[PDB]
Amino acid sequence: SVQQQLEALEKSSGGRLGVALINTADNSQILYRADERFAMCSTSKVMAAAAVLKQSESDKHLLNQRVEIKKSDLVNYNPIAEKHVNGTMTLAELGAAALQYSDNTAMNKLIAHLGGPDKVTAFARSLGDETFRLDRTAPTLNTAIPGDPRDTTTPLAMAQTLKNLTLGKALAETQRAQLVTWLKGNTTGSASIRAGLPKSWVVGDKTGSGDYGTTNDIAVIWPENHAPLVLVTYFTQPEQKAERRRDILAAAAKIVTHGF
Template structure:
C-alpha cells in the first residue's frame, strides 16, 4: 500500500515535469565551486555534485560532468525499469541458485527466489547485491540495462559488470560509471515524467523513502523536516555515492547526486564527506 505522503509527493513531482518529458535546466544558482574546492582539500578527496530544484530548475553543480563509479546507486534506476516491465506481475518470482548468491545479500541469502517486488525492495532499501544482479539479469544484463538507460535519454551512464565486481573501480576506468548530472537527471526522468507509469513510480518513490542505508549520508546532510528518499553506493578507492530526491516542506522536490572518491586505493569511504557535500548543495536552495 502506498502511503499518502508518497501520493502527495508524486503530485508535486508530476507538476514539475516538462511537457515533452525531456528534463531541462534553465537557471543556475551562484557557482559554489570555492566551497567545494575547500571541501575536497579538507577530505583529500574528489567530489562531484549536481542538484536541481524541480520547481525553479535552479542548479548547483561541481564536477557535475566528471565520471565516477556509480556503485550501488544503479539499483534505484534498475528497480524503476524492472517495476515498469512487470507492472502487472509484481508477484512473479525470480529464481536463483546458491551459486548466484554474492557478498552482501542480507535478503537473498538462504532463499532460492524473490518476487519482483521483493527483489526491488531488497536492492533499493538494503542494497542487496544478489537482488541487484537479479534486476540486471531481468533487464538483459549490463548491456540491456545500458540500452534501457539510453532509451530514457541517458547517454552517459554505462553498465559493464555485475555485483560485486562492478565496485572494483580505479582511476581512469570508465566501466560502471556515470556523472552526477546524468544520475540525478535520470532519477528525475523516472520520478517526474510519464516514462514510468504511476504505479511503478509510486513504488519506487516509496522504496527510496524507506531506504535503510542513507542515515549517515543524505539524511545527515538534509535539514530537519525535509522528506528524503535515496540510494547509496560504496566502491573501491573510498568511493561513496548517493542519489536522492529531497523535498522541502511546501516546495517542489530537489533531485541530486553526490559522488565522491579518493586517489588512494586503500582509502576508506567517508559518509561525513557525502553528508557535508549534500548539506552545502542544499543550502543554495534554502
C-alpha cells in the same frame, strides 16, 4: 560562495567530489565537476529496478513472478536474499531488497531477468540518458578504478535521470510511485545525504560504496514548503584501500541545500 565552499571541502577531503543539484522550483542547478565520470557503484541499482518497472507496465504478472534463491546466488553482501535460501523471491521483493538494503544478490537477479548489463544500458538510453553505462554485475561493478569507464556516469546525467524517474516522464504513475516508495524506505543512508538535511525533510535515496574509498548517494528531497530537489553526491579517492567518507556527502548536501 557555494562554489568556493565545495572546492574547499574537496581540497581538505583528499579526493575528487562530484555534485549535481536540480531545484525543480525553477529548474536552476548547482554543479561541481558535474560533467566528470565517476563509478556509480550500487547507485546503479536504481536503473536496474526501474528497468523492471518499465516492463511491468506491459505485463501485470511480472512483479509477482518468482525467482528461486539458491545458496550459490549469495555473493559478498545479501542480508535479505540470505533469509530466503531454498525459497523464492518475487521480482518486487528483489527490487525492494536491492534498493532498501543494497542486497547485491537481489541486484544480480534483476540484471539476469533483464538479460544482462547491456540491457540496463539500453533502458537508460530509452530514457534519454546518453551517459550511463552498466558493464558488469555485482560485486565487480564496484571496483571503481580511477579512469576506468566501466559502470560510470556523470553527476548531472544521473541527476537528470533520477528526476525523470521519480518526478517526470520516465515511468507510468503506478510504477513511478512504486520506485519512490522504495527510495523513501531506504535503510542504508542515514550518515550520507540525509545527515546533511533538516530532520523534517522527506527523503528517498540510494547509496553506493566501493574501492578507492568511493562513497556515493543520489536522492530526491521533499522540503516542507518548497518544490522538490534532486541531488547526486559522488566522491572517490586516489588509493585503492581508502576509507569511505559518508561524512563528506553529508557536508556537501548541507552546503548546497542551504536556503531551501
